[PDB]
Amino acid sequence: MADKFAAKFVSHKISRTRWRPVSASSLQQPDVFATGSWDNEENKVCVWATSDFGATSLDEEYQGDPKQLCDIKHPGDVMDMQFLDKERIVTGSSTGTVTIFRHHENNQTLSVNQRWEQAHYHVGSNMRAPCTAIVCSSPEIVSVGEDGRINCFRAESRDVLRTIDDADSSTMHGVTFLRTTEILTVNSVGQLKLWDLRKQGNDPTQIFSVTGERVPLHCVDRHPNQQHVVATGGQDGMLCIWDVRHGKMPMSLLNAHEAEMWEVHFHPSNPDHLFTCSEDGSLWHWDASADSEKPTFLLGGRSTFNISRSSIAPPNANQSLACAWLSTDPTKGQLEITNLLPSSTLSVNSLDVLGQNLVCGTDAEAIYVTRRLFS
Template sequence: MEDVVAKYVSQKVRKTRWRPVSATALQAPEVFATGSWDNEENKVSFWSVGDFGGLSSNAEYHGEPHLLCDIQHNGDVMDMEFLDSERIVAASSTGSVTIFRHHQNNQTLSVNQKWENAHYYDPSGGNAPCTGVICNSPEIFTVGEDGRINVFTADRKEAVRTIDNADSSTLHAVTCLRTTEILTVNSIGQLKVWDFRQQGNEPSQIFSITGERIPLHCVDRHPSQQHIVATGGQDGMLSIWDVRQGSMPVSLLNAHEAELWEVHFHPSNPDHLFTCSEDGSLWHWDASNDVSERKPFLHTGGRSTTFLAHSGINQSVISAWLSSDPTKDRMEITNLFSNPTLSVNSLDVLGSCLVYGTDAECIYVKKNLFA
């Protein structure tokens, strides 16, 4: 585990996000942001794992992540997303949405734009937490406990568009499907697709898991095949969906023992997927072509060791995640981290580097993911 470094930060970490790098950049990501929660004073912080102390670029990280700058954040940080390489958008439990700008010349953070009452239960001031944010520059989409969807742009004080009663239940997370479409997940186990080319305030598609209405906490879209979506639920299940067909998930995968807080496809290697949970674990799901040649689909997580066969695994040219033949191949799951007493709240992956944050007031950076 020498390729993992930890930093105690004296704050519970709710979100971790790598600063985006150019698609043509060869160097590993160096800067990431964190947002805290459940502290007397919460912060958005920027960190570097770059070349400090004269280490060569090929050296292991010998030191901890280095704090570049931080700024006070009003309320818990519920979600964060980079708008570009200089600006990050933070969603607050107070219902506000703030864009912070990172000034790299003097390593400071400042408020670039703020929407105070983006989410609220009633106009008289009953603010509702803003639970999710996704950026598709120049647009910023936010969702909240109030069932509201907002569309903002950084240069406007008012929302570009608001759907006030988009959902009668809490919206927990949001992702972009295409330029004009977003997908939300809610507290009764539904996925809804919203097409902003349409004038109405109704979703264009609704998906759900039959049976119990288990809340869905997180969602991520496959980076190159936009019809493939992964969600994580309160019951720890990982679900894979194909939004082109049907209304139910393609695969339901037994995963964590408690709430699944975050799911991310690897942005450039999407046969790899990562999940983290309230049960203190962080899993790497590997559906790449060579898995069956290396080892069987064996997971070393908190549950008893099992071989899982299901409808999501096959090295089809269409996708490793969408096959109807479970016998063709198996997928490997590895538990990259285990602290059964405290939650792993957030993760982000870029290149060969993974960053994650916990309620143990620690942030971790793992490099050489595929070594």
């Protein structure tokens, strides 16, 4: 059952649907994905395979219905995850258990490759906290929790390989990599804090905040083309454009949306594409990095579209753009917004794009997969 999108009803509250990485790979597009269930009776991690719509060469056709290959119990809820490789998945648990599973495309089962039954406790009272955010950078894995501590693990380690402690408890929302050795997080108050993974100890290494326009920040990602460029989604729906590797003050604050920003991700095979979800259930397609190809309808800032080369025009004096660092108002940083879909189902909480392929999960226990209108 698909219209412009694979619609899969699994009757399980969808928490995680991430491609067992196949985009930018082989001569075959993604068709294998890993699923993590939340608030379902069997809190579980599954492998699933989706088939191409219609009938193609030697691929046993199929009009739809992606199928589970294997399932395994995950104690507690299943919140955060990253593919350590195609064959290893890293998952957090509410019980303080962080599990890397070695899953198999050969026999279709998951095996407990590694399990940290204990991790991530705030320093000052040594209270346990759940693993709030996770991001893998092979071989390193960087995790944070609402304790405010940071844990750097390796795939094969059983101990906390590196721990950045803190005496100031902070509830974060999302994490990303500034460099190979640098991590950044959003904070539930609109703060972006930086720590050196090679410098350890209590109290945040550095804290920075949105200036003038202040909303709590719920998501962060480094831009693929520029990791120093960082995007953060917030509670209001305001978007901040950053050029940050040591920065403190945002150089673009644009009040875009009026609903909380769950997640926005860069298209990996097209970082000029960005995909955006909202709490109401609506979705948005962005086609721009520092330019404009789509329009935008509620974004702040100045300027739309781009000037063309070749001069056939009256003799004009045109001025270069102003010093954006001299102001704290919505200005350039345009990345466009297109309402390809207003709310259609229950609140969408997770979306992902790998290559020209997109997947997302809703509170309707439904998975929606798209492949066009951006490819």
